Structure 1
């Protein structure tokens, strides 16, 4: 099976920039190649086919070229929508195989996050559980470190972190740090503190509450 060597594995250009993504066939597929775009969590929409042909409804910012074992995709005047995943596919020899994909990212300036902490709802409590939740939004770069405390003592148990991929609307990320306790243990504590440390800030962002309240 022919190996579709895709390059580069990821990027970070600016808006209105231009990218060239080159896919490299293990052999010589005579232009039987397709260029797919996958928009976040959606499905695919074919961009180029047979190597150099634009698919209908496809903008003239997109265009591909190549011969033999070596093919590429360029997108001029990049736009927010364009910052998604791209995959080449080869359909000359069986089995048809796909490239390893290329993620695309908008280079942004640093952002300090906007941190919100959320006590457990009095619906989860009455249910037995109790999660203390924390959102850190609209920041760059992705690398963040959140830390929890309970009346001072730091807590690593029961936390669960989730990052979103980049928002193309604003080139930022967000993450939700979840602490999950038993309603009993929750009731046995006063203070709950969420600490975001980002390359942006010298001292962490502290949001906390009193269960007392």
Structure 2
């Protein structure tokens, strides 16, 4: 089997610009390479087959080139519907091997996260549970680090995080950090903070509350 490696997993670009996605192989596959597109909903469709032959129904702004071991996919006029994950596939010799895949993302102006902290619901406390939820919505870039400090001390374990894909509308990102623990553990302390370390600020954004 041939190792099909795409050197870039994540790629950012502004709409209208030209983007190029590369694909490398450990062996020469002699122009027997195909490109695929996987939209966010999971659907997969063939774009370019045999290195350059555009498939029936593919926009002319899509193009592929390369020879031997190195190949590339190019989109001239980047459009919002082109935001997807692209895989390269060789078929010189069995078995077929897909590439690592390159995720395409829209570049925009940097935005500070909107941090919101939430106490455990009174309905949940009756069930013995007590989840402390921290929302970090609509920020750019994607890179961001959270820190649950409890009584001034950082809480490492028990943190449940969830990240969204790039927003289809404003191209921003959002994260949901939940401090999952029981009611007994929730009443043992009384200082729940939520530090948000992001590029947009030197000092991190801090939201907190207390069950006083």
TM-score normalised by the shorter chain: which range applies? 0.7 to 0.9
Q: 1:157 to 1:32 in 2, by over 3 A?
A: closer
* 1:75-100 deviation line (CA, Å, top 9, x unaligned): 11112232321111012210111122
1:201–1:71: structure 2 CA closer, same or farther, 3 Å change rule? closer
- CA distance in 2 between counterparts of 1:83 and 1:107 reads 11
Question: Partner residue of 2:91?
Answer: 91
Cα 1:184–1:70 shift into 2, 3 Å:
closer
What do the CA deviations read for 1:103-145 (whole angstroms, capped 9, x no partner)? Answer: 2232322211011112222332222211100010111222323
Tell whether 2:42 aligns with 1:50. Answer: no
The aligned counterpart of 2:164 is 164
Cα 1:70/1:148, change in 2 over 3 Å: closer
Q: Report what 1:102 is aligned to.
A: 102
Q: For 1:185, what is the secondary structure of its paired residue?
A: helix
Task: Give deviations 1:29-79, integer Å, cap 9, x for gaps.
Answer: 343221011223513211111221222332222121233433321111112
Q: 1:128 to 1:16 in 2, by over 3 A?
A: same
> How many residue pairs align between the two structures?
212
Using structure 1 for the length normalisation, give the TM-score: 0.85
Aligned equivalents of 2:114 and 2:11: distance in 1? Answer: 26
Q: 1:123–1:56: structure 2 CA closer, same or farther, 3 Å change rule?
A: farther
**What TM-score comes out, normalization by structure 2 length?**
0.86
Distance (whole Å) between structure 2 residues aligned to residue 168 and residue 188 of structure 1: 41
| Change in 2 beyond 3 A, CA 1:183/1:53 | same
Structure 1 unaligned residues grouped into runs of 5+ = none
- Change beyond 3 A, Cα 1:20–1:148: closer
Give the Å deviation of 1:190: 4.4
- For the Cα contact (< 8 Å) 1:81–1:168, is it kept in 2? no
Change (3 A) 1:27 1:191: closer
**Distance in structure 2 (CA, Å) of the matches to 1:23 and 1:202:** 37
Aligned equivalent of 1:130: 130
Aligned-residue Cα RMSD (Å) equals 2.4
Deviation by residue 1:178-206 (Cα, 9 ceiling, x = unmatched): 11121123245544332223221244323
SS at match of 1:123: helix
Q: Which residue of 2 is the match for residue 78 of structure 1? A: 78
